[PDB]
Structure formats: structure tokens, C-alpha cells
Design a protein around this motif. Structure first.
Motif, mmCIF file in Angstrom:
data_model
loop_
_atom_site.group_PDB
_atom_site.id
_atom_site.type_symbol
_atom_site.label_atom_id
_atom_site.label_comp_id
_atom_site.label_asym_id
_atom_site.label_seq_id
_atom_site.Cartn_x
_atom_site.Cartn_y
_atom_site.Cartn_z
ATOM 1 N N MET A 117 0.315 4.141 -2.841
ATOM 2 C CA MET A 117 -0.169 5.472 -2.496
ATOM 3 C C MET A 117 0.755 6.585 -2.972
ATOM 4 N N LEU A 118 1.948 6.259 -3.476
ATOM 5 C CA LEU A 118 2.854 7.294 -3.957
ATOM 6 C C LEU A 118 2.377 7.916 -5.262
ATOM 7 N N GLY A 119 1.693 7.150 -6.110
ATOM 8 C CA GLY A 119 1.168 7.658 -7.360
ATOM 9 C C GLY A 119 -0.240 8.200 -7.208
ATOM 10 N N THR A 120 -0.883 8.412 -8.353
ATOM 11 C CA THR A 120 -2.253 8.907 -8.362
ATOM 12 C C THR A 120 -3.169 7.922 -7.646
ATOM 13 N N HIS A 121 -3.805 8.382 -6.571
ATOM 14 C CA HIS A 121 -4.679 7.533 -5.779
ATOM 15 C C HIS A 121 -5.851 8.358 -5.270
ATOM 16 N N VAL A 122 -6.949 7.670 -4.965
ATOM 17 C CA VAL A 122 -8.165 8.293 -4.454
ATOM 18 C C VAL A 122 -8.649 7.472 -3.268
ATOM 19 N N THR A 164 -6.489 12.035 -4.048
ATOM 20 C CA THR A 164 -7.830 12.492 -3.710
ATOM 21 C C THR A 164 -8.400 11.598 -2.620
ATOM 22 N N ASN A 187 -2.036 14.647 -7.322
ATOM 23 C CA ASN A 187 -2.661 13.498 -7.963
ATOM 24 C C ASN A 187 -3.385 12.597 -6.970
ATOM 25 N N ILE A 216 4.186 11.569 -10.334
ATOM 26 C CA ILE A 216 5.035 11.021 -9.283
ATOM 27 C C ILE A 216 4.610 9.584 -8.996
ATOM 28 N N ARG A 217 5.569 8.672 -9.104
ATOM 29 C CA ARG A 217 5.281 7.245 -9.185
ATOM 30 C C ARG A 217 6.229 6.499 -8.262
ATOM 31 N N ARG A 245 1.180 16.034 -1.814
ATOM 32 C CA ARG A 245 0.182 15.009 -2.082
ATOM 33 C C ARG A 245 -0.024 14.185 -0.821
ATOM 34 N N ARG A 257 0.824 -1.205 0.000
ATOM 35 C CA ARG A 257 0.000 0.000 0.000
ATOM 36 C C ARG A 257 0.861 1.258 0.000
ATOM 37 N N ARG A 258 1.992 1.231 0.709
ATOM 38 C CA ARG A 258 2.859 2.402 0.752
ATOM 39 C C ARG A 258 3.447 2.712 -0.618
ATOM 40 N N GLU A 259 3.670 1.688 -1.442
ATOM 41 C CA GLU A 259 4.178 1.916 -2.790
ATOM 42 C C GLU A 259 3.066 2.359 -3.733
#
Lengths: 40, 256, 273, 177, 273, 131, 256, 40
Positions: free
Chosen positions: D87-92, G16, G14, F123-124, G56, D83-85
Motif C-alpha cells: 500500500m505504500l506505492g501506487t494502489h487503488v 485511489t 498515487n 513513492i515505493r 497518500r 499489504r502494508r508494504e
């Protein structure tokens, strides 16, 4: 320019720029605005 | 200014339905039913409009939603061809025209889990169970108020009941393109879909040709709480609207 | 046309990402509603996604094989392929049939191209300079019985003369009785316990009888006539679910027994990528 | 093993912390999306662009509470294994409540203007996964697993071009009545 | 346009002949700067030196050979040349490949001409009146497996029917995902220790599958299909050094071992003429 | 760059992307590293033709420091920065170093690069490269 | 005009987050974070603003709330100094400046009982467990995403974990003077606190100096219904905002 | 005159008279005039 009289000979119409995806995406009776609660 | 979008009331004729957990009603293709205008009529006889006599909510026999139920399918106006004077106006003519206001009912507590797929499939020509070039016999596709139970055994002349293939060769996940609504026991208990007249002609037969087909397909299995009855009643109520008939005729003769 | 609008941090009570699909509506949620987006333009019109282009490109939709030889002593000619007839159906080829079935109603004037090629596997010194007569047969027109029948006059039946290898090009206005073709007909032609389901007046457009009019040479020239079709003036209504199972018949959505799975099973659990 | 209605039901388990719900690539022309309407329409084209709309609907009991995090991993990086990896990118972050459906729009994050519809390494769309934010809490007298319904739809900025023949339908014998 | 201006003796402190190439600039020194020149005019426009004409003339860029015969008993058809497919590449012919590689980025709508000729070295009394079906295959389109596959319908796949000897002429808008073709791609499709370098999405445009649709005659007709290509709407960027060593592959600048010298050695010392 | 094995051999990502190490054209070739024939510019083009590209000569008698402002050059508005290298810097001695009598036959060459107008999107999870 | 105050959505970069039972967000001291104005700057180097890269929502490892849990404490920006590029911008400089938008998550049904105290204590200098004149060692007060579990055993150099004394000699009941919010399982499940930059200087170190400290102290013990799991996950999500750094430097060297 | 609608059918543009060899011959930051010392 057409070379024939009857409509079976004319070319295609190209593209219908008049689009309206609401009839398929939002076919709902009451209006639903983005952001507002769908149900209240 | 305080109101609610889940409290809805639909009054047609002498029938009235009330609900407090309903979802935004779906108007198929954003087109409300309307009477056939003169600019498109092809038949010459004048149409009769039993506005109040037939345009009322007719409650169909409720279904039992179990943990293993595959779904149910109803054909219109077949589902109402044995209902009062509408059936007589449907038989005694060669053709008919009318809209439908479908109302599915499935109530439960906040502990139950499950999701029903209420979808209207215009021109739902079902597939036969024998394959090759076999046909589906008129005696089955036109059940009446009985509908088609997709969990029963197939009989000679009835289409296949593989709910996965929508009985026509299309996947269940793709039925959402049609006007549909989900009855989510946690959010919604009653679905409403106003169905207009959908056909390639201004008028067509109403006995041999069913314009639309109503389907109730449980997507998420019913998970009742510990100690509760593993069954929930599903009551389907359909109300014709903008009804028209032309050419009062010797009764239409169907088998049986 | 603007593709994505500029949007920065959003801290408000309006949650465009939360909705209720129980209503049956698909909220047009854009990328600017979930993340911070920049100003971008479409630079795209969508001319190739229109129904007129998606369904309006010439393609093969039927084929047959015939011969032109000394027909002496062949009592049954048509069944011996001295001339073959095909009922017009847009549901015999699958790669176009599926695109046509994606909707419930389609209205179109048609375009046909009849492709015949001369050939001689057996001993034959040359390939004749054939002149193929292609004939349209409306419902009622005398379904010919022999290669030399009283029909080929074509006084009311449309005829097109042309040599093998080269193709005919005739347009057909929409010949349906309704306002469109009944891609799905959840209805019968009439009320009988023995009638056929789906296949009705809306389906039968006539038939195309293929032959050659030249008198025979000294060898059998097995001709295979492939038919191509383009759709013109295409209009679509009531979009439907994509075809998943294949076909076995024309105009019928009937499928076979024990059909093969269509969903690609995963390699591992649901958590694999 | 075979196609079933359960294929569209994402199983959820109660009392699960920092665990993955589901994981899938974003090759809309193959895999789980190959059979969807969007995938079926895309397979008729060779190039596709725009943003995708991914939505999940909760169907469990109304007295249940659960928080899920839908994470989109742009291309270039492997699929998130934790989950920690993710949540670094685009997440909602999805809070399940009166609103039973979440709508996470997969943003168009690519160098090239168009990606290939057929699975290709250079034009990979990335990965999509969901994780348990805090836990799934069911009310008393309720057992078993609850299921999510996942939806896919295209944004108004979606593009398609270069039509091609699909590989989802076949035929080896010309059809007769 | 003036070519050379009039200039007489020059005795000044401004030395246009002396500069410093360490700056990387090429001073536009004219003949009037070193000698005494007269008034002359260009009388030349340079229409044939434009990239649109230098790269925009039809030329052969690929070729194959196939046959049209009784295909009975040939399990592997495509590999037996009952139909052959070629991946579109502008890097298989060298005399056009070099001109295309002279720049880093090129954007163009294409023009194709497919040249097929009928022939019979073996005993064959005639050369059939063939009708060749040329087919475009976009990425994903079912790469056909047999000469009679379910693909030749060409409902979405472009098809062009024509007889052997005569050629098809279809235009193709720029089908790249970028704003131009990556004539040089100093980059990988993705990050893997086993991926291919250079050849990526930018390179693969699909493929062209060649066949004949006519049913067989009595002999093998070994058809050689030569493909011609003209570039249209040509735009060039980032000019590069001319190609010196030849090629071995498509899209790769890899060359062989012990390659031959390219500079013409002198006959004698550096002082010889 | 071109591979040293010819035929249809590829150049392996592990070599073309050295890092600050760069590629020394005088060293021995390793499996997966491109060929280092400086004459053919490692890609099949002659050294004398590289002047078509933006370049500058460091002539010890006239210049000791070169400066080249490189913009973003690519067929797309945005592309990968890990698997795709837009530009490549080369320092090729044209005239051999002739040091005076008694001086050290070596001169240090220091390369300094400064990014400008930098942009990143999405950011990835860290990009995973070998090693 | 119909809306809700519990349905909130916060979009940063990015990421939400969505919630339907949230309480009115608390803006510490009614001062939103703002970039350092020129009228107060003392350093001369220009500041870099990784606006979208670092601002973020970063989800921290969830905690297990049991019947005997005393609480949890996190230090900022320490809690995010190992998170992506923010940690690198924090280390490779001598100082940093940034706000924080804390978002605590703890969901449960209407049967559970309990109350969590989410409070932000600027300059939370903790007390050592040895007393006298003992110090607290840098290796403990700066855990990282781990935080400080007040129920564990004390180690040499880590402050005391007596949640009653707030680890600094102040009573738990007096922490309400700080900007805080209660997560009452019956009324609220997600807390939100927008934390600005609080310090006596315009800019200070971000590695050796933690401006604020987040604490989640269960006030009312967790009382789960009969037969339910005696544990609830608490997920803390923090999003930097208005970030600034000055003096890109050789990496800041911390122990380990 | 064109006989087709889509741009894939139009003919070539001919010649681009807009020439500018300075970007390739003098891609220098500071302006260099012919005759003046290149470096000073």
C-alpha cells in the motif's frame, strides 16, 4: 516522382494518421462516458 | 429525468423481448447493418427483401449450463436455416445477405456465481481433431439450430472441441478482441450483440458460407448455492435484419 | 500531442476507475484518473505500428530446390526438379503467416524477390553464368510438364529473365476476386460432402514455376531458389486473436495432437513474482 | 500442469484478512502476459512505453461483499510481501458492489523513455499484486471459491517501435497442402 | 574573421596576462595581449573539426570469419561458424572507440557497411557467386541456432541480401532509449550484489548474425566478414579526458595490470630540449 | 571506475557506492572495489586531462574554499538515484603539502554538498540495498 | 441527469480508493484543511511541503470485529509516524502541520446487523486506570499503527479502556457532538471524515502532541447470520493532506 | 534532393557554425573580464 504508369509500381502510402480506436474499444450502442456509471 | 440503462426493449416484426438487467448492447465495430448499396453490387439480379417475414426473434433450444460445461458454438445463418421462411429464402437461392441481432438469455438469483463469454467470431474456421492435413466435414460445421457442444465426443468430420484453443488454434483469453459481452450473474443476465454482414464480397453464399459464429463459453464455473439445482438454462435468440436474397432458384440441396 | 494531463487530488462522485466489463467496452482510463500526474507530451507518432509497415516489409515466404543438368533420359522432369512449381501461398512461413492472420481480411499489391544461388558440392570447376526464367502461372495457364514445354514462350504468362544470385522485382496488383484476402473463410467453395474447407478460389492465386533456360554444363548445379515477399498497399479489417498453436498446412487452422503448452507455468504459487 | 480455462480464474477464499490474492511481474513480453493480445503485439517490437490498464472483474454472488486493494510496485523495490508494504506505492482500493469491474491504470514510472519488451533487469517495469483489504464475505447457502477475471489493455499513450521477430511461433518443415 | 588584432606597446594597469586558475576559468588571452601583433585574418572555417566530421567517417568497427560448406553432421552449427553473430558495439575497435569516448553522451543515426571477401586456401577450382544474407536482431528476436533456422525469414528482422565482395548500405535511426548513448554509465542496471557494471540496456543494441544462404559447393570457403561503420547526425555532450590506457573489454574502462608508461620520458634533466 | 584485476573483471556495487565514506585512493584494494591509482583517475585517463571537466584548484596561497554548482547530467529526463550516480566529486592533491618547519603535517579537508532542485517520483517500498 | 451519492472516489497522490455504498463525507466543522497563512505564523523557519510524497492513503492493519469487541482508538499523526517518509518528516523536525482524510472500511452482506461509531475527538486526553492523581504514560497513548484496543488488559502507564466512559470520563452517547459517521451494515460500509488541523496554536509539535484521535466504537453488536463467521474485518485508511514541517533537525528520539 | 522518405536516409548536416566555447572555458558564476583582477 514515379517512373511507371500503372498503380502497381507506386510506393507505399506511409502512415494512415486517421485513427479511431473507438470502433474496437467502445463498440457499444449507448454512449458511455468515463466516470459515469456503466450501468444504471 | 430518470431512466435506467439495464431496462431495454427490442421490437422486431411481431416479436418483442424485454429485459431489466441487460448490459449496454454491443454494435460490432460500431457499424450497424445496412442494405447493400448499388455502388458495390456485382450480381445483376434484383434482391428481394422479406423485411417483416424473416426479421424477427427466433428462439433457439435452450442449453443446460452445468459445472462441467465447456461452452457452445453456433454458426449463422446456419443456426436459422431450418427456421420458417428464412430457411426457404436461404436454400432456394444461391446467395443471401442479412444482419443478425443476437440476444443471449441466462437468468439467476443474487446467490449464484459464474460468467459466460458471449463473443462473435467472424469467419470462425474450426480445426479438425485428426491434425496433419485433415479437413472438417461440412456435415458438422453446419449443424443448424443444434449448434456445437464443446463437451461432447468428437465424430469423424467434426472439428475439435478444445474450448481452450477456440477450436481454431487461438487462446480463449484472446477472444475479447472480437465484439463480445460477459453475462455476469451478479451484474448481467442477458447479452445483446448487433452483428452486421461481415465479408470480403458484397454478396456471398449463405448455405456453404457462414459469415459469423456465436460462442457462449463459461469463463467462471457455475457455483450454485447450497441445495440448489446445479444447472441454469441458457436461451439464445437471434433476429435477422436487413435481409436480402438474389436469384430464386431450385431448392438448395444439402445432405440429408 | 499531450500524453498525460496534469491532475491533482480527486474527491468526487465520478469514479472513472469503476466500470462494468459486461458491456464489452474498454473505458479509456488514463493515469490521471488513478493518480496525480504531471503534464507530459507524446513525442511519438507511431509510424512503425501501422499495418502498412507491420506487414509491408520484404521477407522470405517460400523456397525450393532445382537443378540444371543434362536432362536426357528423365521421363518425369518436373518431379525430378528439372523445373519446380510452387502454389502462391502466404501461409507457408510462420513468422509472416501469423502477422497476416492477425486480421480476417487483407488487401495488398505484392512485391516478390526470387533469390537463387549457384553451388556445386560435387566436382565442378566453376559456377555457370546462369539466366533464370521466373514465370507466373494464372489459373488455367498450362501447368508446364517439362523444362522445355510449349509454355516457356510466356506470351500471356509473365516471364522474368535474370541471372542466378541477382533477383527479379515485379509488382502484382491485388489479384483477389473479393475486396481482400480471406484470411479466415468459415465457408466452403460449394455444397458437397467431399469438398475441401477453407482452401477455395480466394486462396489459389496461381503458381510460380522455377527453372533455368541455359543448356546444360558438365555437372549438376543443385539450385535452391528462396522467394521473398513484401506487402504493399496493405489494408486490414476485423482484427483477430493472435496465433497460439502452430500450423501444419496452408490456409487451414488445423493443429496437431497433444500440442505443447503455450502458457509459461509459474515457479511456485500464484503469489510468486 | 496443462493449459485450462481455470488459468484465467483468480481463486478467492472467504474470511481471509490481510492476505495476498495474486502476484506477478510487469514484463509484458513474458510470463502471464506473454500470451495476451497486448503481449503478443508487444513481442513483435523491441521497445515499449506508456501506461498499462489492468482491470479485475468480480464474478461471485451478487449478495457477496469484499474489498480488494490492487497495488503497483514501481521498479527498484522487491515484490511486496505484505499489504502494508504494497500500500505504500501506487494502489487503488476496490470496493466490490454494483460496479463489478475495477480499472487500475499502471502509470508510466521510468527514468528511460522506453523499456525493453524482452525481460531485462535495467528496464524492469516493476511488480503488480492484489491483497484482501478487509475480507471476502459470502452470503448464506454459498460455499467454494469465487474467481476474478483479470484484463490487460494499453493506454492511448502506448508506444512501440523497432520491430523484431517473435519467438511464440515456430516451423521446421515448409508447408504443403 | 579577424585572427589577430593590431596592438602596439601597452603600459596600463590592466594585466591580461595575470589571472588566477583557482577559479577554473580559462581567460581567452590572445597574442595581442603579450606582444605587439599585426592585423591578420583567419582564412579558416573549421569544417573538419566538427563532431559530425570527426566522428562521422566510415571505419571498420567489427569483423568475423565464417564458412559455407556441406554442413551435414555438425550438431553445433553457430559455434562451428556455419553462421556467426556479433553484438553491436562501438567499443571493440580502439581508434574509433577513443574518439567516441572523448564525450559522455553521443546521439547518432548509424551507417553500416558489411565487407565479405571470398577465398580458398585449400584446393578449390573457383570462388562461388555468393549471396550473403545480413540480418539485424533486435532484443527479443530469436537468436538463431542453425544456419537454416526459422529466423532467416526476416519478416520482422531486417534482412539485406547481397553478393560477397559487395557491401550492404542500410541506415539506422538512433536506437537508444535515452537521448544519447551512455559513453560513460557510472551506474548499474539494477541493485544487486552480482550484476554487471556499465553494460546495461543502453549498451545492448541487438546483434548482427552473418551467414550465406546458397547451398554448398564442393569446398570450404572460409569467409571473413569485416564490418564498417559511419556515424550520422552526431551530437556530443560533456567532453571528457582523452583515453590514456588501452581497453580489454567492451563498454568497460577496465585496464590491465602493470600497464606500460604513456608519458615519453625525457632524455636528461627537465632543462633539456 | 576501473577494476584492479583487469581482463574482464567488474567493480562491485558494494564499493562504488560507499556513502559519506567516499573512496580513499591511498588505501588497499578490496575484492570488488575499483583500482585507486590516482594517476589514471581510476578509469584509465591521465590526471592532467581532468581539467576538461568543471573543476577548481584550492591553492593554499590564493584560495581555501572551492565551490562548484553541479546540475543534473544524464541522457534521460529521469533515472535511478540508488543504482546510478550521475556525478562524482574528486579531491586530488596536485602539489604535495609542504607545512612550515615545526607545524603539524596535516590539514583538514571538509566537503559540504547541498542538493537543489530535488525531485522524486513513485513513492515505493523502501529501496533495499545490501547491509 | 442520473448519478449516485453512494459511489465516491478519492484520489490522493498515487493512491485511489473506490466505494459504492459510502455515506456523505463529513467535513469536520465545515472547514477543509488549509495551509498555515502568513498572518498567523509565529516560527521563522520556512515550511517544507512534501505534497505528493506523504499525502497518500496509508492502509492500517485491519481489526477483527467480534461479538464482544468494545472498540478501537487511534491517535494522529501517531498512527502514521512509522509510515514511510511521513514518519521521517515527523521525527526529524520539532513540529509539524497536516490534515487528515480518514476512511474506515467495513463491508458485509445484507444479512449482517451492526453499527460502528466512527468519531474524531480532537484533543482526546485519556484517563488513567489507577485514579487519584495517576498519569498516563507516553509509551501507551502513542502506540503507532497499533492503536488502542479497548478490550485488552490494562498495563502500567496505559489509560483506562472503559469504552462506555470514552476513556476520558464522558459518556458514549455524547460523542455524537464531534464529527462522526455511523457504518450501518444495512446502509453504509465505508465512512469518510476529512479532518483539518485543530489546535490553539498555528504550529505545534507532532511527536509529543496528537491533535486528533480516531475511534471505532461498535454501538450495535455484530449479529452474523446463522452459520457465518462471527467476525468482520475493519480496515482504517488515513491520508495526510496539506502537510507542513519546519526546522529539519536531528532525528526526534522516542523510547525504543 | 532526397530519394527516400524517412529521416534515416538524409545526409549529414555539414557543420554547426553556432559555436560557444564559453561554457567550457569560462563556466564561472561571476563574470570575469580579460585584464581585470580575477580575484579581488
Amino acid at each position: 516522382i514515379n517512373y511507371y504508369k500503372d498503380a502497381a509500381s507506386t510506393s507505399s502510402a506511409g502512415q494512415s494518421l486517421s485513427m479511431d480506436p473507438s470502433k474496437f474499444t467502445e463498440p457499444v450502442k449507448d454512449l458511455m462516458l468515463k466516470g459515469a456509471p456503466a450501468l444504471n | 429525468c430518470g431512466y435506467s440503462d439495464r431496462v431495454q426493449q427490442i421490437t422486431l416484426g411481431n416479436s418483442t423481448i424485454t429485459t431489466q438487467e441487460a448490459a449496454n448492447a454491443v454494435v460490432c465495430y460500431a457499424e450497424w447493418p445496412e442494405y447493400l448499396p448499388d455502388v458495390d453490387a456485382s450480381d445483376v439480379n434484383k434482391t428481394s427483401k422479406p423485411d417483416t417475414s424473416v426479421c424477427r426473434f427466433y428462439t433457439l433450444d435452450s442449453k443446460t449450463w452445468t459445472t462441467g460445461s465447456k461452452g457452445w458454438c453456433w454458426k449463422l445463418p446456419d443456426a436459422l436455416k431450418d427456421m420458417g421462411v428464412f430457411g426457404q429464402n436461404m436454400f432456394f437461392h444461391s446467395l443471401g445477405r442479412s444482419g443478425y441481432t443476437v440476444h443471449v438469455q441466462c437468468n439467476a438469483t443474487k446467490f449464484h456465481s459464474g460468467c459466460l463469454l458471449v463473443v462473435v467470431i467472424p469467419e470462425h474456421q474450426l480445426a479438425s481433431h485428426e491434425g496433419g492435413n485433415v479437413s472438417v466435414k461440412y456435415t458438422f460445421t453446419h449443424p443448424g439450430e443444434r449448434g456445437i457442444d464443446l463437451s461432447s465426443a468428437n465424430e469423424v468430420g467434426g472439428p475439435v472441441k478444445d474450448v481452450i484453443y477456440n477450436m481454431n488454434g487461438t487462446l480463449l483469453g484472446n477472444l475479447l478482441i472480437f465484439p463480445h459481452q460477459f453475462i455476469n450473474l451478479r451484474t448481467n443476465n442477458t447479452a445483446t450483440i448487433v452483428i452486421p454482414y461481415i465479408n470480403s464480397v458484397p454478396i456471398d453464399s449463405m448455405t456453404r458460407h457462414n459469415n459469423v459464429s456465436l460462442m457462449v463459453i463459461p469463463i467462471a464455473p457455475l457455483t450454485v448455492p447450497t441445495g440448489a439445482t446445479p444447472s441454469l438454462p441458457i436461451t439464445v435468440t437471434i433476429a435477422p435484419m436487413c435481409t436480402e436474397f438474389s436469384g430464386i432458384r431450385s431448392k438448395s440441396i444439402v445432405p440429408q | 500531442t499531450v500524453a498525460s494531463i496534469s491532475s491533482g487530488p480527486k474527491h468526487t462522485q465520478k469514479v472513472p476507475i469503476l466500470t462494468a466489463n459486461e458491456t464489452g467496452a474498454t473505458m479509456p482510463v488514463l493515469p490521471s484518473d488513478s493518480i496525480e500526474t504531471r503534464t507530459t507530451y507524446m513525442h511519438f507518432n507511431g509510424s512503425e505500428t501501422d499495418v502498412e509497415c507491420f506487414l509491408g516489409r520484404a521477407a522470405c515466404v517460400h523456397v525450393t530446390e532445382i537443378q540444371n543438368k543434362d536432362a536426357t533420359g528423365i521421363d518425369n522432369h518436373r518431379e525430378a526438379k528439372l523445373f519446380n512449381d510452387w502454389k502462391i501461398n502466404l501461409s507457408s512461413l510462420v513468422q509472416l503467416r501469423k502477422k497476416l492472420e492477425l486480421f480476417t481480411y487483407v488487401r495488398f499489391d505484392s512485391e516478390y524477390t526470387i533469390l537463387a544461388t549457384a553451388s556445386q558440392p560435387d566436382s565442378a570447376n566453376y559456377s555457370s553464368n546462369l539466366v533464370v526464367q521466373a514465370m507466373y502461372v494464372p489459373p488455367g495457364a498450362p501447368n508446364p510438364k517439362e523444362w522445355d514445354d510449349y509454355t516457356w514462350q510466356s506470351a500471356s504468362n509473365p516471364s522474368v529473365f535474370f541471372k542466378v544470385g541477382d533477383t527479379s522485382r515485379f509488382s502484382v496488383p491485388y489479384v483477389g476476386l473479393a475486396s481482400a484476402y480471406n484470411c479466415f473463410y468459415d465457408g466452403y467453395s460449394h455444397d458437397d460432402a467431399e469438398t475441401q474447407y477453407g482452401i477455395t478460389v480466394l486462396n489459389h492465386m496461381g503458381s510460380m514455376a522455377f527453372r533455368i533456360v541455359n543448356e546444360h554444363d558438365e555437372h549438376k548445379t543443385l539450385v535452391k531458389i528462396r522467394v521473398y515477399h513484401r506487402a504493399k498497399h496493405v489494408e486490414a479489417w476485423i482484427p483477430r486473436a493472435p496465433r497460439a498453436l502452430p500450423y501444419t498446412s496452408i490456409g487451414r487452422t488445423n493443429y496437431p495432437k497433444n500440442t505443447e503448452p503455450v502458457i509459461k507455468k509459474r515457479k511456485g504459487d500464484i503469489k510468486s513474482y | 500442469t496443462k493449459d485450462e480455462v481455470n488459468s484465467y480464474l483468480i481463486p478467492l477464499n472467504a474470511n481471509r484478512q490481510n492476505e495476498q490474492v495474486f502476484g506477478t511481474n510487469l514484463f509484458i513480453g513474458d510470463g502471464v502476459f506473454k500470451t495476451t493480445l497486448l503481449g503478443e503485439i508487444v513481442q513483435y517490437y523491441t521497445h515499449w512505453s506508456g501506461s498499462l490498464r489492468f482491470s479485475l472483474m468480480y464474478t461471485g454472488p451478487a449478495l457477496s461483499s469484499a474489498k480488494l486493494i490492487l497495488a503497483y510496485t514501481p521498479p527498484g523495490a522487491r515484490g511486496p510481501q505484505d499489504r502494508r508494504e504494497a500500500m505504500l506505492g501506487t494502489h487503488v482500493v476496490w470496493d466490490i458492489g454494483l460496479q463489478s469491474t475495477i480499472v487500475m491504470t499502471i502509470p508510466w514510472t521510468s527514468g528511460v523513455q522506453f523499456r525493453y519488451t524482452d525481460p531485462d533487469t535495467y528496464t524492469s517495469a516493476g511488480f503488480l499484486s492484489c491483497w484482501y483489504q478487509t475480507s471476502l464475505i459470502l452470503p448464506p447457502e454459498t460455499t467454494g471459491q469465487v474467481y476474478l477475471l483479470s484484463f490487460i489493455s494499453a493506454c492511448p499513450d502506448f508506444k512501440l517501435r523497432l520491430m523484431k521477430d517473435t519467438q511464440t511461433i515456430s516451423q521446421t518443415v515448409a508447408l504443403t497442402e
